[PDB]
Amino acid sequence: QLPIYTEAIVEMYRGKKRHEVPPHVYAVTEGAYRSMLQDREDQSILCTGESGAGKTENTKKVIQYLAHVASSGELERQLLQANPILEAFGNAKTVKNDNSSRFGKFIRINFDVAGYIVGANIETYLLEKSRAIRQAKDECSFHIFYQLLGGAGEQLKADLLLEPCSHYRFLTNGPSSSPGQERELFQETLESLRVLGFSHEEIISMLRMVSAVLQFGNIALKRERNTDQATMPDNTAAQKLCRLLGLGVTDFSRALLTPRIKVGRDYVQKAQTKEQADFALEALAKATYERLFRWLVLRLNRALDRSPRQGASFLGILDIAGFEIFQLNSFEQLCINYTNEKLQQLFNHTMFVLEQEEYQREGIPWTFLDFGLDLQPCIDLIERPANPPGLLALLDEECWFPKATDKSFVEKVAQEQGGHPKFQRPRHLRDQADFSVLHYAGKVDYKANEWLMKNMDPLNDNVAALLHQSTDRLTAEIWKDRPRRGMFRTVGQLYKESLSRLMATLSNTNPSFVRCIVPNHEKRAGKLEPRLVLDQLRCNGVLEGIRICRQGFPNRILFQEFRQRYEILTPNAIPKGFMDGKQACEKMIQALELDPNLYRVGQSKIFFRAGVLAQLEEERASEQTKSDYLKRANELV
Amino acid sequence: EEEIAALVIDNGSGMCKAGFAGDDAPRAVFPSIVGRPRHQGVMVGMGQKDSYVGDEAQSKRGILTLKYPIEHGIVTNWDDMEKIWHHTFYNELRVAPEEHPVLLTEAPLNPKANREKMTQIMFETFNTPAMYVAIQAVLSLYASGRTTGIVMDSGDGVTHTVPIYEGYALPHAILRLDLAGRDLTDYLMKILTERGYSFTTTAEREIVRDIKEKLCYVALDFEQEMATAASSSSLEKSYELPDGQVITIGNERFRCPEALFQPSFLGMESCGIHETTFNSIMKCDVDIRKDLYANTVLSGGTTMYPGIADRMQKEITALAPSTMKIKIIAPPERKYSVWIGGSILASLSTFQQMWISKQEYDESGPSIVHRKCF
Amino acid sequence: EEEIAALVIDNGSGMCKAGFAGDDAPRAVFPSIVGRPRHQGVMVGMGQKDSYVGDEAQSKRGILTLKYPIEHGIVTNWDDMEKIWHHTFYNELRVAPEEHPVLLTEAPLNPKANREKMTQIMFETFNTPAMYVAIQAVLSLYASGRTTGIVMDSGDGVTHTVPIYEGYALPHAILRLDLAGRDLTDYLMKILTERGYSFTTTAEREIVRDIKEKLCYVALDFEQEMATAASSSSLEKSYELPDGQVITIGNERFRCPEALFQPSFLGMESCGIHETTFNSIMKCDVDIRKDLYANTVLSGGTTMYPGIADRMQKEITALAPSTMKIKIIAPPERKYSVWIGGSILASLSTFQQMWISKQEYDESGPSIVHRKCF
Ligand SMILES: Nc1ncnc2c1ncn2[C@@H]1O[C@H](COP(=O)(O)OP(=O)(O)O)[C@@H](O)[C@H]1O
Ligand SMILES: Nc1ncnc2c1ncn2[C@@H]1O[C@H](COP(=O)(O)OP(=O)(O)O)[C@@H](O)[C@H]1O
Ligand SMILES: [Mg+2]
Ligand SMILES: [Mg+2]
């Protein structure tokens, strides 16, 4: 805990440029705030996934700055309270981290034209809902599931009819303890909800549906001898479900197993396989969870209070998990990578516009390619639906087509799209992972197993309708629903759509960028693990940023500085002092023998390549060596 | 928008089944009929409306003479077909076909002219970016989600049979049999007449179509059921006409669908449907038959009759080697199987390159239908 | 690792028998067939897969036309062979041939081009440190663990005969007879046709191959067994086709293998196998014959038929001096004898210097195959 974040420091930061003071968050967020009052356009702050880093904790400090600047009842202290809620629902214990945010968090701080806080809301774009159904080999699902299991007493468990971890099909890898003792955490979380002002009733309802999602596992569909349709011979589980919701068992049973579909204007049944119905069960699980999460966010934003609304503008703060790499790298890993791709692209574009406008401010006309384009072919590789089709598209095509195997998928994508330079088939010996792509971060390997199954999210409209008719208030209110909705509807597709919404929102505004790194596992300072920092530099795109700016003229020095500082270099070139400081640089660059490609003449500055000043500095240390020698010799003799 | 959606239309005779690709059921399904006012009207401030199309015609039946523009999978009258398509796009879907690629179904072994002329219309009537014309049976096989099977496709138009193994397709093996829902209807109105009920006109021809669509069923043994017709109890059913008259139909009920299995009733030599299925399978290579016997898929409206599957099972099993088990897979929702198949095909990503493009047509002409697609 | 292991592949026509040297049985054994989709497929999201190789082809038989790339020990089509090898290494063994020396088998008296071109492939297709190409018969003799014998080698490719004494080998004495499993198959499908069963296509040609691989047997006297065919009891056997059809084959059963002993049935003058064995032995020096008569080793797939050994014994004994006893040593597991022999040879320490090295090839060219090895 560092002495930083006092009042003097923040006051000290005010109204200044970033270079003017030392690096700090307060600076970049000052940039955002100033750009908003100045530019009257909305701003966005991107934090890239890092633990567990206390990215939120840092962001509390950003809010603290925001409060002190904007004046004129403490800050929203419940923002601290929000963390455990969203943390509990949203995050899971994974190989990289025991707590990691699956869902993206967009925190909107709303500002009037005066520059004061009207209020705030939270928005949660991407979620991995597939994590609830399906999981990595040695990882855990969302925290809330486990903390619910151990945490709830007979008082609540008896209502919810929760069971231990072994009972549920949807829970992979067993209990996977994990504790931590748990139970205490759950207890904390309940209070965290309560202070926020949700009723005990509401909490119980929430926890009941959280059971419900898990319950979707206990239902077993049994394939029938000869017929396709399958069925559910054991009513107990779905009976439990029906208690846990408004559904009549019979209604639900017909609906799930043999749903009716509107072939206008007259309804007709459908035959469903065992596999198809299983996917429907998993879908309603996943969609149920997603809906629940959405409602929590909206109900939460109701728990947040605003003054006079609609006025005027906001500052978004995006907390999302960064580019991930594991050894195995499953499907979710790919989706995450895809999103981090687009975000990275936005950053490149932003940087691009910054540099292009900086050139004009210095009067140098220069044309150079969009930096965003670097990522674009990789993005098209994953996304592009049409002419050559993308990996997601091709996956979807695989999923629907009759007898689809994972192998047919990879073969198909090789055949369809192997000519793509960012796509690489390893071939030959293993190379355990079956195909690979080349991101900004680097080459990542993907294992295709069970991708088709993960992709499937067909949703029965009939069962959905039943939910819309539920007796209980909570779930019915939730299901208060265009695309390809029904059957079709794939997780990849929905995910893509959701990301498109997010990219539109961010794209509307002016972004700003913060990159978080953890030095070590130790949870202690004074230890920086270079390998880990390298890894983080890869996945946050910072390496890409350096390889971007190298392509331009990263080093920018003023005429005055260049002359006063480096004058020692070239006594010959530099005249008797015509001054004006342009002529100085003209002379210096001229005799120093530098390619015109390697610099430009700007209004206040000269723009330089990488390594040009390295050479010039070597000529200053060489020059200084010559002068040290001449001085020392002269004094001696 | 991304992918633009796509449009799908199934026109075997009798019904137009249309909707957006990427959905599990079609939005609009209505009878493919063009009724014309045969009787000269005398009022003022009528219509006039030279003709009516779709279930409009069903509503105002008495006045009109109805003409089915498609017979036996062949379009008799093109302007009529164009009118029906017009009705689908503008009256139901409310789409500009310029904004969507359109998929059409079409029956096997069918005259070239129909495909070619079909495409000619789609490009030079409803300006459209792209289109495709696809075999009915394959589509249903997709809809069933199986890669292999022998799809027995009988609509109102004609009956068809296309064996498929692991995708692929056997041209020589494809069989097309001239029987249909419409021929059953013609037979049925004939058979009623022995009971006294006389249905002479297109209007009431559709009334008997309606009867058949519910009352008729197929015998699990024809002679047994006909024997039990002696003591009439369950085999008679009262039906209510729109006129208010009541009809009572006994054994005449089930012998109607019997025709599929005994076309001698109709007076055609052409073998019954089960024998045609054997004709198809027997044409195929010895190796694959095992799964074709086991994977027979029924599609189309005129497989809807209760008990058809069972009878086909009993007959095929009887004829075939009992060495191998003969499963027949006939889903309910079979009626819509073709259209569903179309939906799934246009949804497929790779398919999005196989379209016949407007551009390609403009350079290469209408004849290119056969060149590109099957 | 020490010794790096080594790889062994037996390609007489029909089967690829491959595995690691230093093991008693090969890992992968599958038919050497390259099936191609003869029928144009109509779906989307098939394959496409231009062709199928190995028992994949057996699985999907009906669609494909199958082409055996090796005939009579000669490779007809090289790309096909390369594909088969590709399949062996990558699909089954999962080895990088760069990491292993590979041994190939090959038949005697065989064209130079095959050996030379074979080596050319192994070096300039699958980059490999070393390789060797070895005579089939010798390998089987090693596998039998005897130093001396006359190895009767008949695969599906061609039949071969190599007398060996105390190691050594007699070039003049080596005999190669154009008969094979494949020729028996062609005969067999011919002989079925007189019963009514007609097998016209490559697919079902393999079905008859399967039949022969079990039902057929060799008569201990042909005429006697054919006489007893009058009263058909045991000589008929029901066989089940994959189609579900049943076949019933009497005398036709055993006269199929009879062909080996009476090539006049096939229409060739070339003497029967037993006479060819005499032809080999008689070419050899008078001194050694005693043990060759006593040490005849049978190898290859098409010696598997029950009763062949006995018939060969009766015929050879009949022809030869009864002064000396004629033992024939025909092990079960003979089918794999070549491959086993290969395993044992690559396992041998001294052999590890006789390899044709990549380096040697690069300097001296492909022609060096004959120079170094037999
Ligand atoms: N519920 C039903 N029961 C029995 N027969 C039916 C039923 N519905 C339709 N049919 C018969 O099938 C025909 C409809 O076939 P349809 O699927 O429209 O063919 P297509 O798809 O080729 O146009 C009707 O004309 C009628 O004879
Ligand atoms: N169990 C069996 N019984 C009788 N004949 C067989 C049997 N198995 C294989 N064959 C015959 O032998 C052939 C296989 O020979 P194979 O050993 O593969 O030759 P090579 O080693 O030269 O490829 C088959 O094509 C078949 O005709
Ligand atoms: Mg139809
Ligand atoms: Mg051999």
Side-chain angles (χ1 to χ4, degrees), chain A residues 1-305 308 311-481 483-621 633, chain B, chain C:
Chain A
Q1 292 183 355
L2 297 184
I4 316 294
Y5 317 104
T6 186
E7 293 298 309
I9 190 160
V10 53
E11 202 70 18
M12 173 181 303
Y13 291 139
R14 291 172 52 84
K16 286 162 190 191
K17 295 294 172 73
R18 59 189 259 194
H19 59 275
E20 298 177 25
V21 297
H24 197 274
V25 183
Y26 293 166
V28 297
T29 191
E30 181 177 348
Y33 174 92
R34 284 299 177 201
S35 65
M36 193 185 62
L37 274 65
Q38 179 56 46
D39 204 3
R40 64 178 292 280
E41 295 180 34
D42 293 324
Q43 298 295 319
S44 295
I45 299 291
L46 302 189
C47 293
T48 49
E50 185 71 11
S51 53
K55 286 170 64 202
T56 303
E57 290 152 34
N58 191 331
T59 300
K60 299 191 314 208
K61 304 173 177 181
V62 172
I63 295 161
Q64 179 179 349
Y65 166 99
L66 222 145
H68 287 296
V69 170
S71 296
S72 296
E74 266 206 334
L75 277 159
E76 308 315 309
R77 193 180 165 285
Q78 58 186 11
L79 287 175
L80 299 141
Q81 199 54 271
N83 292 322
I85 307 307
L86 294 185
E87 186 183 322
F89 279 25
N91 296 176
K93 176 182 163 54
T94 64
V95 71
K96 298 291 293 195
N97 194 343
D98 299 354
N99 188 6
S100 174
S101 61
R102 287 311 164 192
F103 73 94
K105 186 184 302 192
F106 191 69
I107 301 170
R108 290 182 176 269
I109 302 177
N110 301 120
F111 302 124
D112 59 9
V113 283
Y116 304 131
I117 309 295
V118 306
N121 67 64
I122 302 295
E123 291 181 351
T124 59
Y125 290 86
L126 273 47
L127 172 63
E128 290 186 4
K129 60 182 207 172
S130 39
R131 183 168 301 279
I133 192 51
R134 292 283 198 182
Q135 297 79 6
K137 290 155 68 189
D138 291 341
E139 289 183 2
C140 301
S141 64
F142 306 118
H143 293 297
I144 186 64
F145 299 152
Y146 301 99
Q147 52 191 43
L148 175 61
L149 294 174
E154 58 175 312
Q155 294 166 344
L156 197 154
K157 189 166 65 167
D159 296 335
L160 276 62
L161 283 68
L162 299 169
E163 297 199 305
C165 319
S166 185
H167 302 74
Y168 297 98
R169 167 195 190 269
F170 274 22
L171 293 176
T172 194
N173 213 14
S176 304
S177 290
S178 298
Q181 308 145 324
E182 300 300 328
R183 188 165 191 279
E184 191 280 328
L185 295 179
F186 172 79
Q187 195 63 22
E188 171 52 42
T189 311
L190 265 64
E191 167 61 12
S192 63
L193 293 166
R194 182 151 193 172
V195 56
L196 295 168
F198 302 124
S199 180
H200 188 274
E201 191 171 14
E202 297 195 310
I203 300 303
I204 186 161
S205 302
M206 293 166 65
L207 278 62
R208 263 184 210 154
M209 82 177 298
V210 176
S211 183
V213 69
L214 295 178
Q215 290 290 339
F216 283 95
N218 302 334
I219 168 164
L221 296 169
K222 297 296 173 197
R223 185 177 175 76
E224 293 291 322
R225 183 182 287 176
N226 199 53
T227 56
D228 198 0
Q229 200 162 298
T231 185
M232 183 186 64
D234 62 326
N235 65 323
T236 185
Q239 186 56 59
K240 209 158 134 155
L241 169 59
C242 293
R243 294 188 53 203
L244 201 40
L245 291 179
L247 302 186
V249 57
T250 302
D251 305 339
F252 170 75
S253 65
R254 289 196 314 279
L256 166 67
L257 193 62
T258 157
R260 72 180 326 177
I261 295 93
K262 182 175 185 171
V263 40
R265 292 179 300 280
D266 325 298
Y267 312 116
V268 164
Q269 284 186 356
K270 190 155 178 209
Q272 290 210 328
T273 63
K274 179 158 72 80
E275 299 269 30
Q276 276 179 358
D278 296 344
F279 300 119
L281 297 169
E282 297 180 351
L284 289 167
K286 291 147 67 165
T288 279
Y289 190 77
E290 191 211 314
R291 297 300 190 79
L292 158 53
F293 186 76
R294 293 186 57 192
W295 172 94
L296 168 60
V297 77
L298 282 175
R299 193 39 192 172
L300 185 43
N301 298 336
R302 185 68 188 79
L304 304 161
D305 293 317
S313 297
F314 62 102
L315 170 62
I317 297 167
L318 169 49
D319 170 17
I320 189 167
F323 188 89
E324 297 188 338
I325 305 176
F326 320 137
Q327 195 175 329
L328 185 64
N329 299 324
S330 79
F331 173 56
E332 322 315 349
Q333 184 56 74
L334 166 68
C335 296
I336 297 301
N337 293 336
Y338 179 60
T339 177
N340 287 115
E341 193 82 7
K342 288 203 195 164
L343 295 175
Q344 191 58 52
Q345 185 202 15
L346 185 63
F347 156 86
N348 296 357
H349 180 69
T350 302
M351 192 169 173
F352 174 88
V353 297
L354 190 55
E355 285 186 24
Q356 192 170 21
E357 68 179 333
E358 181 63 19
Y359 294 126
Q360 298 199 340
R361 283 193 296 274
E362 293 308 316
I364 295 170
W366 189 60
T367 64
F368 55 103
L369 193 64
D370 194 350
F371 299 127
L373 291 185
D374 291 311
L375 301 172
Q376 181 66 23
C378 181
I379 298 170
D380 292 334
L381 173 65
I382 303 163
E383 176 267 342
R384 173 170 204 81
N387 47 0
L391 288 143
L392 281 168
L394 293 176
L395 171 74
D396 299 8
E397 163 153 22
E398 196 61 48
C399 87
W400 297 320
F401 175 91
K403 290 291 174 298
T405 49
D406 177 33
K407 305 290 187 64
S408 180
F409 169 74
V410 275
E411 288 147 19
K412 180 180 292 176
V413 305
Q415 177 175 11
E416 189 62 30
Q417 188 160 41
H420 196 274
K422 298 298 199 182
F423 178 98
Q424 294 177 340
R425 181 64 92 89
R427 300 192 181 166
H428 318 272
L429 299 171
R430 298 192 173 182
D431 305 326
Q432 291 193 20
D434 296 330
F435 68 91
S436 308
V437 298
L438 255 60
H439 298 277
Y440 49 101
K443 175 174 177 186
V444 177
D445 295 343
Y446 297 110
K447 192 72 178 176
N449 299 352
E450 314 310 339
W451 278 28
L452 295 171
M453 286 192 219
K454 289 168 179 193
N455 192 25
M456 293 289 289
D457 172 42
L459 188 53
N460 283 342
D461 266 29
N462 196 8
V463 180
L466 297 179
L467 295 183
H468 182 73
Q469 287 167 6
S470 304
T471 196
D472 292 353
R473 301 162 303 171
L474 185 67
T475 185
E477 174 266 8
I478 287 174
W479 286 96
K480 212 153 172 208
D481 289 13
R484 305 168 152 166
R485 295 279 292 285
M487 202 189 63
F488 298 125
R489 181 177 172 172
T490 61
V491 303
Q493 189 70 30
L494 296 153
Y495 186 87
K496 184 179 163 188
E497 184 151 18
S498 169
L499 173 61
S500 185
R501 291 169 177 183
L502 180 58
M503 295 295 303
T505 66
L506 298 183
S507 184
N508 295 132
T509 63
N510 188 9
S512 175
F513 307 127
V514 178
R515 304 298 196 254
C516 313
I517 284 95
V518 300
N520 60 33
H521 295 80
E522 295 197 336
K523 295 301 176 62
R524 199 182 154 288
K527 167 68 179 173
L528 182 138
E529 189 70 19
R531 181 186 169 174
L532 253 65
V533 175
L534 289 171
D535 291 322
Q536 293 166 2
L537 290 177
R538 303 202 178 273
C539 97
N540 67 1
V542 166
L543 294 183
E544 173 186 11
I546 60 179
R547 68 185 185 78
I548 285 169
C549 53
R550 290 171 73 169
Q551 296 140 10
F553 310 150
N555 300 131
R556 301 186 162 78
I557 299 300
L558 297 160
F559 293 84
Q560 182 61 57
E561 295 177 355
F562 180 76
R563 179 185 192 153
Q564 197 159 353
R565 294 293 296 169
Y566 297 100
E567 187 172 4
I568 299 293
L569 295 173
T570 179
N572 303 125
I574 296 167
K576 301 163 175 74
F578 305 150
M579 289 175 189
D580 194 17
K582 293 178 174 178
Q583 285 83 344
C585 291
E586 294 171 359
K587 293 296 187 66
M588 291 163 83
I589 297 300
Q590 194 70 252
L592 277 27
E593 192 57 47
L594 193 57
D595 184 30
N597 185 31
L598 277 54
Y599 62 86
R600 292 284 178 272
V601 49
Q603 296 286 313
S604 304
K605 298 187 289 293
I606 302 302
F607 299 156
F608 289 103
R609 298 284 295 277
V612 293
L613 294 171
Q615 300 159 353
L616 296 181
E617 188 74 5
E618 184 187 325
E619 296 298 335
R620 199 163 70 78
Chain B
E1 63 272 22
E2 285 187 338
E3 300 176 346
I4 317 302
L7 285 177
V8 182
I9 309 192
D10 166 354
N11 268 339
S13 303
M15 294 182 85
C16 267
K17 291 172 279 197
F20 298 98
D23 278 337
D24 49 355
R27 295 274 187 287
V29 294
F30 57 84
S32 298
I33 50 176
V34 168
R36 296 186 187 280
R38 152 212 50 172
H39 293 306
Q40 64 173 8
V42 179
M43 305 279 283
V44 175
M46 292 186 286
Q48 288 187 345
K49 288 166 192 175
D50 181 45
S51 183
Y52 301 154
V53 177
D55 55 346
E56 183 178 7
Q58 294 289 314
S59 188
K60 293 188 183 179
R61 202 171 306 166
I63 301 308
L64 288 45
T65 172
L66 306 162
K67 191 175 162 56
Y68 284 119
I70 319 175
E71 275 319 303
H72 303 316
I74 315 304
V75 305
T76 64
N77 197 349
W78 281 102
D79 45 27
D80 297 346
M81 183 49 46
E82 177 267 321
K83 285 178 167 188
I84 287 186
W85 283 325
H86 190 273
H87 176 273
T88 67
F89 295 113
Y90 304 125
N91 303 143
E92 268 76 22
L93 300 179
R94 304 185 184 174
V95 294
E98 298 86 346
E99 305 166 345
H100 299 281
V102 59
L103 168 58
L104 292 161
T105 203
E106 192 250 22
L109 264 62
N110 182 331
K112 291 179 72 83
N114 282 330
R115 267 190 194 74
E116 275 153 354
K117 184 66 175 163
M118 193 164 290
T119 54
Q120 180 164 0
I121 288 184
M122 276 300 171
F123 297 129
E124 304 190 323
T125 301
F126 317 125
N127 204 47
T128 174
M131 78 172 289
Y132 187 77
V133 288
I135 213 85
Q136 286 170 359
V138 161
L139 269 56
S140 75
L141 171 81
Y142 269 99
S144 286
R146 326 166 56 80
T147 60
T148 296
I150 178 165
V151 170
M152 173 67 188
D153 151 29
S154 52
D156 186 74
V158 142
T159 291
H160 307 86
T161 305
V162 178
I164 223 89
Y165 172 85
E166 195 62 31
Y168 301 109
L170 296 166
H172 51 283
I174 289 167
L175 189 54
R176 159 180 178 178
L177 174 63
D178 299 5
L179 285 181
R182 205 163 159 284
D183 304 332
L184 294 175
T185 290
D186 271 331
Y187 179 71
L188 184 60
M189 61 179 269
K190 195 167 68 68
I191 207 82
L192 266 70
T193 54
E194 68 183 3
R195 201 167 285 268
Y197 312 126
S198 288
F199 294 152
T200 52
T201 304
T202 315
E204 69 266 38
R205 203 166 164 275
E206 287 207 317
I207 293 297
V208 285
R209 183 172 64 84
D210 193 26
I211 282 168
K212 182 193 60 166
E213 291 176 351
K214 54 180 170 293
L215 303 191
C216 298
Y217 68 89
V218 183
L220 283 63
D221 187 11
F222 172 74
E223 290 83 352
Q224 290 177 359
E225 287 190 348
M226 201 161 60
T228 187
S231 59
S232 298
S233 175
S234 298
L235 308 159
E236 295 173 3
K237 255 166 202 183
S238 182
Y239 182 74
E240 181 70 21
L241 260 58
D243 168 28
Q245 196 172 344
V246 172
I247 300 301
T248 299
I249 52 160
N251 66 328
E252 154 199 324
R253 186 202 304 190
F254 59 84
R255 70 180 161 181
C256 180
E258 181 62 13
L260 299 182
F261 306 91
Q262 299 283 319
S264 306
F265 290 174
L266 286 171
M268 289 178 296
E269 299 194 359
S270 305
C271 292
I273 62 170
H274 56 294
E275 296 86 342
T276 62
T277 302
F278 247 84
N279 196 13
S280 296
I281 288 168
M282 278 296 103
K283 280 179 192 294
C284 304
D285 283 22
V286 300
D287 182 65
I288 64 168
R289 290 193 190 122
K290 63 188 181 294
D291 71 355
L292 290 179
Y293 281 108
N295 312 140
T296 293
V297 168
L298 295 181
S299 85
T302 194
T303 42
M304 289 297 289
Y305 304 136
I308 286 164
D310 295 326
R311 189 176 165 76
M312 290 285 286
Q313 190 152 351
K314 83 168 184 67
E315 293 167 339
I316 287 179
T317 304
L319 296 181
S322 66
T323 65
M324 59 180 55
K325 292 184 178 175
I326 316 301
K327 177 170 73 182
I328 292 170
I329 168 162
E333 204 171 357
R334 61 170 84 92
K335 177 175 291 187
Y336 309 111
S337 296
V338 170
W339 188 88
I340 300 170
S343 79
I344 190 166
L345 233 65
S347 305
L348 258 61
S349 299
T350 301
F351 180 66
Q352 291 198 332
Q353 198 161 7
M354 300 172 64
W355 291 101
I356 301 166
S357 296
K358 181 54 161 67
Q359 182 173 353
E360 291 180 334
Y361 169 69
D362 296 320
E363 286 125 341
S364 313
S367 67
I368 67 107
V369 182
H370 304 291
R371 180 178 177 176
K372 194 180 285 283
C373 73
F374 181 83
Chain C
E1 63 271 22
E2 285 187 338
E3 299 176 346
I4 318 302
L7 286 177
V8 183
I9 308 191
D10 167 354
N11 268 340
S13 304
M15 294 183 82
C16 271
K17 291 173 280 197
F20 298 100
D23 277 337
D24 50 354
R27 294 274 188 286
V29 293
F30 57 84
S32 296
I33 49 177
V34 166
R36 296 186 186 282
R38 154 212 50 174
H39 294 306
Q40 65 172 8
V42 179
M43 307 276 284
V44 174
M46 294 187 283
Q48 288 188 346
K49 288 166 191 175
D50 180 46
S51 182
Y52 302 153
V53 175
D55 55 347
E56 183 177 7
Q58 295 289 315
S59 188
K60 292 189 184 178
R61 200 173 307 167
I63 301 309
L64 286 45
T65 172
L66 304 163
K67 190 175 162 56
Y68 284 119
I70 321 174
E71 275 318 303
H72 304 316
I74 315 304
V75 304
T76 64
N77 197 349
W78 281 102
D79 46 27
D80 297 346
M81 182 47 52
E82 176 267 321
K83 284 178 167 188
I84 287 186
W85 283 325
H86 189 272
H87 176 273
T88 66
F89 295 113
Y90 304 126
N91 303 141
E92 267 77 22
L93 300 179
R94 304 184 184 174
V95 293
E98 299 86 346
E99 305 166 345
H100 299 280
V102 58
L103 168 58
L104 293 161
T105 203
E106 192 251 21
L109 264 62
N110 184 332
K112 291 180 71 83
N114 283 329
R115 265 191 195 74
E116 276 153 353
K117 185 65 176 163
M118 192 165 289
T119 56
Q120 181 164 359
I121 288 185
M122 275 300 171
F123 297 127
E124 304 190 322
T125 302
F126 317 126
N127 204 47
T128 175
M131 78 171 289
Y132 187 78
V133 288
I135 213 84
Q136 286 170 359
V138 161
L139 268 56
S140 71
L141 172 79
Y142 270 99
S144 287
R146 326 166 56 79
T147 61
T148 297
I150 178 164
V151 170
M152 176 66 188
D153 153 26
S154 56
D156 187 74
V158 142
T159 291
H160 308 86
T161 307
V162 179
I164 224 87
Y165 174 82
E166 195 63 30
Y168 299 108
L170 296 166
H172 52 283
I174 289 166
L175 189 54
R176 160 179 179 178
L177 174 63
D178 297 4
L179 285 180
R182 204 164 159 283
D183 304 330
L184 295 174
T185 289
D186 273 333
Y187 180 71
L188 184 60
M189 61 179 271
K190 195 168 69 68
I191 206 81
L192 267 69
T193 52
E194 69 183 3
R195 201 166 285 269
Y197 312 128
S198 288
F199 294 152
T200 53
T201 302
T202 314
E204 69 266 37
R205 204 164 164 276
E206 287 207 316
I207 293 297
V208 285
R209 183 172 64 84
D210 194 25
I211 282 169
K212 181 192 61 165
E213 291 175 349
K214 53 180 171 294
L215 303 191
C216 297
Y217 68 89
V218 183
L220 283 64
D221 187 11
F222 172 74
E223 290 83 352
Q224 290 178 359
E225 287 190 347
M226 201 162 59
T228 188
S231 59
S232 299
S233 175
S234 297
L235 308 159
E236 294 174 2
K237 255 167 202 184
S238 180
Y239 182 74
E240 180 69 21
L241 259 58
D243 169 28
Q245 195 173 345
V246 173
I247 300 301
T248 299
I249 53 161
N251 66 327
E252 155 198 324
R253 184 202 305 191
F254 59 84
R255 71 179 161 181
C256 178
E258 180 63 13
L260 298 182
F261 306 91
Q262 299 284 319
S264 305
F265 290 173
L266 285 172
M268 289 179 296
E269 298 193 0
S270 306
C271 292
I273 63 170
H274 55 295
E275 295 86 344
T276 61
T277 301
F278 248 83
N279 196 12
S280 297
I281 287 168
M282 279 296 102
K283 279 180 193 295
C284 311
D285 284 22
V286 300
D287 182 63
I288 65 168
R289 292 192 190 123
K290 64 188 182 293
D291 71 352
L292 290 179
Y293 280 106
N295 312 140
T296 293
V297 169
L298 294 181
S299 83
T302 194
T303 42
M304 288 297 289
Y305 304 135
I308 286 164
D310 294 327
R311 188 175 167 78
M312 289 286 289
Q313 190 153 351
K314 81 168 186 66
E315 292 168 339
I316 286 179
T317 303
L319 295 181
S322 67
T323 65
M324 58 181 56
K325 292 184 178 175
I326 316 301
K327 177 170 72 182
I328 292 169
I329 168 162
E333 204 171 354
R334 60 174 84 93
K335 176 176 291 187
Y336 309 115
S337 296
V338 169
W339 188 89
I340 300 170
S343 81
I344 191 166
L345 231 67
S347 305
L348 256 62
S349 300
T350 302
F351 181 66
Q352 291 197 332
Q353 198 161 6
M354 300 171 65
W355 291 101
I356 301 166
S357 296
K358 181 54 161 67
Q359 181 173 353
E360 291 180 333
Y361 167 70
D362 296 321
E363 286 125 341
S364 312
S367 66
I368 68 106
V369 182
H370 304 291
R371 180 177 177 176
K372 194 179 285 284
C373 73
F374 181 82

